[PDB]
Symmetry: D3
Subunit: 150 residues, 6 copies
């Protein structure tokens, strides 16, 4: 029952830097199956729900203004431990402190331009998924590479 | 014209082999802008209209049954000469005969498993674009990297 | 010592996923010299001796039946600290927990489909080396790139 | 009956340039299955049989002296049209006239250091295979990625 | 002979697009040695003198203006037939007509934002090498990669 | 702030191994701007003065000797926290102890053939930038990639 899922989002800086394919491929190479994928310009109301936990933090206004200043490519990968692994692959919050080899470690320098958002726990994935995805935009079931699993 | 567009779709064989990131990355590095993107499972009625021009050929069914066997990730890129460049980057119809450096030449072997589709003319791109996407699913304030165009 | 050696073997899951070139390329770029290389289908008697140290564990059979289900490409690299570096490059036992940049962290997800084997000590490399190869199957006049060593 | 095979060989310059993995991966990425693989230091008598057609040409002596001055990694790939495709992927005889994207096009400059030998026709593959490979060193049959073929 | 040389210049759009490392690496992988390298901002005298074979042409005015607008990393490579070879690796004048695998064909879209300049013949090269470099800024005699030439 | 700067030097073994393009590209992909770049052959005064914090150390003698033996492509990058960040991307002193993903960990094997030097702090950097570069060989004020900083 390795149908764990996560919500990852390439943000407007990651989008404008011509980084969408590099990020998807890191995950496809790992073994994760893409069950949902679309591009959209986030609305103020999704931007604020999405990042609800930072409503009072200073940078909030600055963050919300950004995630809606342009196209974001939202996606949800599935696979065993996909949530903690995807987080590991992204790096940490400050891109300057991310180990070389992680998405932020190889491409970011400013927390303000973090390139990609990755859900931090199953509970939040679920919240963020239902939030960005109508039920029909998600694939129900299919086969991942049979060499990944037992 | 800098706002010409083409429709591309990574096929079931491309998605499954883990080539969605690899393929998007080449159009991005080329400088093309992704103005529409989404994954889905095509329906019999979508695939027939799509490959309409081959309505009666020895392999129509086998192709219509293939493009429906799994997820496709549709996309539209915009930029100068995108339709014709996108075609050069894809290769020729038979993968084996496509040169190294092209998508079909690097990854393909069978005409049946051609990995990706690309509009062949601007008449078919405007037609195929209209076929897979809705008008609110495409971007508008589009500013490609400031160093690509003079 | 510049002539230390380790034994590595791309597993059935690695060969099948098309990772033999990717994996050899990292040891070559690292500067290690390939002094023995070959592909084969392991026999029950080869695999048991190989994974001898796990003779009695809940997953021995499933691992011995896996390493025999297809081709493995065995190899031995020589160079300073090859055994320990080769281990760092591979990752930790569980792929999900391996960091990005390492072989198991970039491509692996399951402990059962660990992609590659690496000797853990020089006692086991000399033992595993002797296990898979014959003495006339390894090189002698070995001159690594002149810019790697002082 | 797409069990066509070819014999490719990374020569001592390709070997010493740390190029073995890059070449194998180009073919694994394409869809070809590795059915045989080993490393050896070619003997004068295999060097001369192998390149029998150039016995009288001037550069012969110079070629044979080279292909035996070091390790060669011999391999045989299988797949539809693998012979003409592998040739296409290698480039032409003069590396300076090879299109960027082909093995020789991206890495060679001297016909004398051509990096890789690829059989030029089925008839010669068969001759070159039996020549470098004992029957047991070759895998008999297994499954290539099912997305490559119909 | 293998001591031929060519002048390559990564133009303002290549520099700003972050392609300097990608370009230098294609040439290094090829076998050419870097004998000169520097970043400078060109001045008019130099630009008009460099782009003299086009003085009486329509697009002229803009050529000099754009190449004077920012950083250019100039370089000269040495190698057997490096002048004709570098040009092939670059592609043709229009980036849209250039093939995937070449620099302009992989990353370019506009004739006016062609990314890199490369001498078109030996006469033009020894001339251009002289305009951008003082004789002490160029290596005298090198020890190329040992396995490149016969 | 984001106008911090660091001195990076690809050492004789990096240059000879053909890694200059790979190294420059890791930094460009990261977000840093190249403000200085040149290849030169260091002279004793410069080497001893550069490697002064090690004068009274055992390996000293050899350091100066080796870095004077061939071409070095010196460079300085500017970016937010570029000094601490470049160092992390480099790895630690011993290449065998460096992690995959870092420059030394991916390509290095010997402490004495460490491939690249990178300033260890801002004080050391502004000092070293001064030793290798004349003030006119460095860009004054740049227009970095627009989507890197907040
Ligand atoms: C701490 C902090 C975060 N942010 C941004 C970084 C994130 N962008 N993304 N993705 C976003 C959310 O912060 P976060 O949840 O602390 O970081 P993450 O979970 O590692 O992404 O705020 C900011 O702009 N300024 C700050 O001071
Ligand atoms: C002519 C031909 C096409 N097809 C497939 C290959 C394509 N898949 N994709 N993309 C699709 C359309 O055929 P096509 O339009 O001739 O090929 P393309 O324009 O070069 O894509 O039919 C086939 O299976 N066998 C054939 O002989
Ligand atoms: C401990 C453990 C190992 N295995 C597998 C993973 C390995 N495949 N490879 N390489 C092999 C050996 O286990 P291991 O020796 O503990 O792992 P490694 O040294 O890090 O390779 O057993 C398993 O399937 N399940 C387990 O829980
Ligand atoms: C024409 C020519 C070939 N050679 C080398 C190039 C080849 N090395 N390999 N592989 C080998 C065989 O020549 P070939 O069969 O003409 O070339 P290929 O089939 O494209 O490989 O001779 C040479 O050294 N000098 C020459 O003048
Ligand atoms: C002839 C031509 C060139 N240019 C640009 C393209 C080149 N960019 N560079 N380097 C430069 C010189 O033109 P070119 O010599 O025709 O092309 P190149 O030798 O392949 O570079 O002007 C253009 O603006 N329009 C034209 O029709
Ligand atoms: C301390 C140390 C360094 N060196 C080498 C490694 C470095 N190569 N570079 N650049 C250089 C300076 O040593 P270092 O400052 O300890 O390491 P670095 O700052 O990480 O480079 O001497 C060595 O020979 N042995 C040692 O123990
Ligand atoms: Mg968060
Ligand atoms: Mg078509
Ligand atoms: Mg083990
Ligand atoms: Mg031949």
């Amino acid at each position: 029952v390795n149908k764990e899922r996560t919500f990852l989002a390439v943000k407007p800086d990651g989008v404008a830097r011509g980084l969408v394919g590099e990020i998807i491929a890191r995950y496809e190479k790992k073994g994760f199956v893409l069950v949902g994928l679309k591009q959209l310009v986030p609305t103020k109301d999704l931007a604020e729900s999405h990042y609800a936990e930072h409503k009072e933090r200073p940078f909030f206004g600055g963050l919300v203004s950004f995630i809606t200043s342009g196209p974001v490519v939202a996606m949800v990968f599935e696979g065993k431990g996909v949530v903690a692994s995807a987080r590991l692959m992204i790096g940490v919050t400050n891109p300057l402190a991310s180990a070389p080899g992680s998405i932020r470690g190889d491409f970011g320098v400013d927390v303000g331009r973090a390139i990609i958002h990755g859900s931090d726990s199953v509970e939040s994935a679920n919240r963020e998924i239902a939030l960005w995805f109508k039920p029909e935009e998600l694939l129900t079931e299919v086969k991942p590479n049979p060499n990944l699993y037992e």
